[model samples]
Target: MAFGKPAMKNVPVEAGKEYEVTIEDMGKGGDGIARIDGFVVFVPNAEKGSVINVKVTAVKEKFAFAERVL
Candidate 1:
């Protein structure tokens, strides 16, 4: 881990970046949850284990927010 900054488990899912992820589970608000090394990324409206591209809109210390692409 880098000092003064947290280490990211999912390096590919950053703000303004895009990725192809397999939706693993559904979140409480019905968003899709994807994981990489246990790093959770919340993708809105994605179904479980479905393959889809997502654009990351924001990244927090623990999780991120994304939207479906196409």
Candidate 2:
């Protein structure tokens, strides 16, 4: 084991790009939840298996805000 590690976990997304991931669950503000590869995203107007056309508008520590507009 290492002695007192000093590294922070990086957030996969920034703010200028969008990733059409898998819609798994819902967000806290009543939206769609999508997973890119590591973190969870918040998408709007999305259903169970309709994550083909979505845009990541905002991002947070918990999830992302994805606009459900195809």
Candidate 3:
């Protein structure tokens, strides 16, 4: 299921964008979880539980997958 509000419509994080945020939680397979604009962003290799620099790699119907910029 899509986390938070579906089809935010007013624009969400797009692909190839840099977003620096604090990792508030984690998901399956130890991916970092952060919500931007009420949507969840899954960042890989983000286990620091701290502020991280990430790049939006791909967006899907279920969730947004990103990569750690660091």
TM-score of each: 0.74, 0.64, 0.76
Worst 10 residues of 1 by lDDT: 4-13
At residue 5, what lDDT does model 2 achieve?
Answer: 68
Error of 2 at 44 (Å): 1.8
CA lDDT of each prediction against the hidden true structure: 0.79, 0.69, 0.79
RMSD of each: 3.3, 4.6, 6.4
What is the overall TM-score of model 2 with all chains considered together?
0.64
Model 2: pairs clashing at backbone N, Cα or C within 3 Å = 42-64, 42-66
**Cα-based RMSD of candidate 3:** 6.4
What would the per-residue lDDT of candidate 2 be over residues 1-70, giving only the tens digit for each residue?
5456633355676566666777777667667777788677777777766655667778776866777656
Flag regions of model 3 displaced more than 4 Å: 1-10
What tens-digit string does per-residue lDDT give for candidate 3 at 1-70? 6668666664477878979877888877777897786678888878656888878888887678788888
Candidate 1, 1-70: lDDT as tens digits: 4776786544656789778888978877878997755768889867887987888898887788888885
